[PDB]
Design a protein around this ligand. Structure first.
Ligand SMILES: [Mg+2]
Ligand SMILES: [Mg+2]
Ligand SMILES: [Mg+2]
Ligand SMILES: [Mg+2]
Ligand SMILES: [Mg+2]
Ligand SMILES: [Mg+2]
Ligand SMILES: [Mg+2]
Length: 210
DNA sequence: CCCGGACCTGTGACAAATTGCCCTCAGACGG
DNA sequence: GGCCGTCTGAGGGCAATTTGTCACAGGTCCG
């Protein structure tokens, strides 16, 4: 199945995207890499890739597309808009989109890679972000270990404000996304908390491949 | 000493958002 | 050639779950 590769600068960028938007973004990066910024998406192909009906594919594409407007991306800093023209459909079942050509070099550069089947069943977009960050440190054989700082997790994934209270961070983000990865990818993930005084400062992740 | 206070933890409630489903009906095409 | 039957997909919606927010119980240490 398709092998996504991307510059680490994207793995570590600050942005806020939905699951459906992140799914489309993987195909754009794939289209661009296999070569102005003009990409295309077919309804019926999207449906087959992610096991959706044609109707629900159409709904997902259409709503993802109008929610890109005004979204912006920050590389740590420098901010860019994803799209520089609205999306549009020349033919029935077909969409044409205009990615910011100044984004091309951030996509293709020190890189991260995974096959698309590894991520296509994940539902929570923050769990997609976490699985991408871990892949960045994976070894050939399939294992790795990394310590991520909590403030940088909050900044980069643009987590919502109530997850600055640590018990809510644990309950609604960390535990849920470690559970998804363990249930929905071929990765097996564990972690431990690093402390300084009363405050928890980092999370230490270890993982292997099944 | 014990206080009120500034920190930290977890859980019960409720609000807001997202999920896969379901139904309608016109577009595109070919036999 | 041209209508119609079928495969699509662009709409309109739904209830069940998940995600996002905050009050209050209950621990520690400080001055
Ligand atoms: Mg969302
Ligand atoms: Mg949907
Ligand atoms: Mg403290
Ligand atoms: Mg004594
Ligand atoms: Mg008392
Ligand atoms: Mg009690
Ligand atoms: Mg008390």
């Amino acid at each position: 199945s398709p092998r996504i590769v991307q510059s680490n600068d994207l793995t570590e960028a600050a942005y806020s995207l939905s699951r459906d938007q992140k799914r489309m973004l993987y195909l754009f990066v794939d289209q661009i890499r296999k070569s102005d910024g003009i990409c295309e998406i077919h309804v019926a192909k999207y449906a087959e890739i992610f096991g959706l009906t044609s109707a629900e594919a159409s709904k997902d594409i259409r709503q993802a597309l109008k929610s890109f407007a005004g979204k912006e991306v920050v590389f740590y800093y420098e901010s860019f808009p994803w799209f520089i023209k609205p999306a549009h459909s020349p033919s029935r079942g077909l969409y044409s989109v205009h990615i910011n050509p100044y984004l091309i070099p951030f996509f293709i550069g020190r890189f991260t890679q995974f096959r698309l089947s590894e991520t296509k069943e994940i539902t929570n977009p923050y769990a997609m972000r976490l699985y991408e960050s871990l892949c960045q440190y994976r070894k050939p054989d399939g294992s790795g270990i990394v310590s991520l700082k909590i403030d940088w997790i909050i900044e980069r994934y643009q987590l919502p404000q109530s997850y600055q209270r640590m018990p809510d961070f644990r309950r609604r983000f960390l535990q849920v996304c470690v559970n998804e990865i363990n249930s929905r990818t071929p990765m097996r993930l564990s972690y431990i908390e690093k402390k300084k005084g009363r405050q928890t400062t980092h999370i230490v992740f270890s993982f292997r491949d099944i």
